[PDB]
Enzyme design. Structure first.
Site, PDB file in Angstrom:
ATOM      1  N   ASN A  49      -9.008   5.178   2.663  1.00 44.17           N
ATOM      2  CA  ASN A  49      -9.694   5.895   1.574  1.00 44.17           C
ATOM      3  C   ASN A  49     -10.632   6.925   2.216  1.00 44.17           C
ATOM      4  OD1 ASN A  49     -11.209   6.568  -0.712  1.00 44.17           O
ATOM      5  ND2 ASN A  49     -11.222   4.546  -1.593  1.00 44.17           N
TER       6      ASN A  49
ATOM      7  N   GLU B 199       0.864  -1.210   0.000  1.00 45.64           N
ATOM      8  CA  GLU B 199       0.000   0.000   0.000  1.00 45.64           C
ATOM      9  C   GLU B 199       0.891   1.247   0.000  1.00 45.64           C
ATOM     10  OE1 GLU B 199      -2.925   0.214  -0.817  1.00 45.64           O
ATOM     11  OE2 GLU B 199      -3.940  -1.699  -0.326  1.00 45.64           O
TER      12      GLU B 199
ATOM     13  N   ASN C 201      -7.424   8.431  -5.970  1.00 43.83           N
ATOM     14  CA  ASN C 201      -8.248   7.397  -6.650  1.00 43.83           C
ATOM     15  C   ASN C 201      -8.922   8.029  -7.886  1.00 43.83           C
ATOM     16  OD1 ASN C 201      -8.995   6.355  -3.311  1.00 43.83           O
ATOM     17  ND2 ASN C 201      -7.494   5.385  -4.657  1.00 43.83           N
TER      18      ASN C 201
ATOM     19  N   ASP D 216      -6.291   8.095  -0.850  1.00 40.49           N
ATOM     20  CA  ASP D 216      -5.845   7.058   0.097  1.00 40.49           C
ATOM     21  C   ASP D 216      -4.698   7.649   0.903  1.00 40.49           C
ATOM     22  OD1 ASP D 216      -7.729   5.250  -0.861  1.00 40.49           O
ATOM     23  OD2 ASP D 216      -6.214   3.970  -1.873  1.00 40.49           O
TER      24      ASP D 216
ATOM     25  N   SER E 225     -11.562  10.365  -4.621  1.00 41.89           N
ATOM     26  CA  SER E 225     -11.168  10.161  -3.213  1.00 41.89           C
ATOM     27  C   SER E 225      -9.639  10.022  -3.189  1.00 41.89           C
ATOM     28  CB  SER E 225     -11.894   8.984  -2.651  1.00 41.89           C
ATOM     29  OG  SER E 225     -11.448   7.821  -3.318  1.00 41.89           O
TER      30      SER E 225
ATOM     31  N   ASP F  28     -12.042   7.914  -8.582  1.00 43.89           N
ATOM     32  CA  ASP F  28     -13.351   8.487  -8.169  1.00 43.89           C
ATOM     33  C   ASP F  28     -13.153   9.862  -7.514  1.00 43.89           C
ATOM     34  OD1 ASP F  28     -12.481   7.820  -5.629  1.00 43.89           O
ATOM     35  OD2 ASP F  28     -14.149   6.526  -5.116  1.00 43.89           O
TER      36      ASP F  28
END
Ligand code: NA
Length: 129
Positions: A59, A35, A46, A52, A50, A48
């Site tokens: 998220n 990650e 992201n 992380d 959003s 969309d």
């Protein structure tokens, strides 16, 4: 902060992640590796819109507030910035909520694609825990 592998394994164990929801410490260290590469300051946008945040790439769509993720939730009741601290308490507390949400560690797509089913024990090998 960029954690060492065993350094992060010790911190995660201290905060009760080892065998949390039945996931062994190596699973959490493996998820953190893929990650964030063990970097508490890691942020990734992201598709969309959003973002992380931190060692476990939590998220903003569901878990933390960053003020720029329309229609999103803050289920860990924390600013996303709190997930970038050198002190992983906030990330661990929030990860415990995520992994409890019903799909276990499949919530972390990198865990599913890169850790699930593998020799995750290797990630705590040589560590004094
Ligand atoms: Na949010």
């Amino acid at each position: 902060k960029v954690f060492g592998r065993c350094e992060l394994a010790a911190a995660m164990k201290r905060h009760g992640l080892d065998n949390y929801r039945g996931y062994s410490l190596g699973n959490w260290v493996c998820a953190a590796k893929f990650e964030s590469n063990f970097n508490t300051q890691a942020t990734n946008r992201n598709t969309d819109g959003s973002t992380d945040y931190g060692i476990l790439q939590i998220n903003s769509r569901w878990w933390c507030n960053d003020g720029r993720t329309p229609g999103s939730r803050n289920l860990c009741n924390i600013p996303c910035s709190a997930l970038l601290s050198s002190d992983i308490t906030a990330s661990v507390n929030c990860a415990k909520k995520i992994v409890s949400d019903g799909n276990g560690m499949n919530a972390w797509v990198a865990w599913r694609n890169r850790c699930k089913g593998t020799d995750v024990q290797a990630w705590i090998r040589g560590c004094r825990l």
